[PDB]
Amino acid sequence: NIDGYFKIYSKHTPINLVRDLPQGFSALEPLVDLPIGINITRFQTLLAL
Amino acid sequence: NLDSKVGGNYNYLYRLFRKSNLKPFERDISTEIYQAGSTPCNGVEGFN
């Protein structure tokens, strides 16, 4: 959350293990940028029950 | 003169003062009443 914006970077990669993040290297290319004009102090994710 | 009428334009509003200085390109939409004193304000002419 800078200069009244919201920059999103994304990257998709398949995985073959069920434990944790792999021992690899991957960059996060920009995907979209859209403006928010209010300061943000807290957040929470959403899950499909 | 375009934005002037004999009746007057009192719709235009400004904040005389705030709790803290505004950051550039920041918009404040809250109409909170400043708690100058420890006592609650409740929108009355009480303690400051």
Which among A26, A36, A29, A27 is positioned nearest to A8, based on CA atoms?
A: A29
Q: How far is B17 from chain A (nearest CA, A)?
A: 19
Q: Judge whether A28 and A9 are in contact, CB under 8 Å.
A: yes
For this entry, resolution in Å reads 2.6
Residue A4 buriedness (CB in 10 A; 0-12 / 13-18 / 19+): middle
Q: In angstroms, rounded to a whole number, what is the distance separating the alpha carbons of residues A24 and A10?
A: 16
Method used to determine the 3D structure: cryo-EM
Q: How far is CA A21 from CA A13, A16, A18, A29, A49, in A?
A: 11, 11, 9, 19, 24
Q: Do the Cβ atoms of B26 and A3 come within 8 Å?
A: no
Which chain A residues contact residue B25 at CB under 8 A?
A: 3-4, 37
Q: Does B26 touch chain A (CB under 8 A)?
A: yes
Sequence-ordered list of residues with C-beta below 8 angstroms from that of A25, at least 6 positions apart, any chain: none
Q: Judge whether A17 and A36 are in contact, CB under 8 Å.
A: no
- Can you tell me which residue has the tokens 């934005």? B3
Q: How far is A33 from chain B (nearest CA, A)?
A: 17
How crowded is the C-beta side of B6, counted as CA atoms within 13 Å?
0
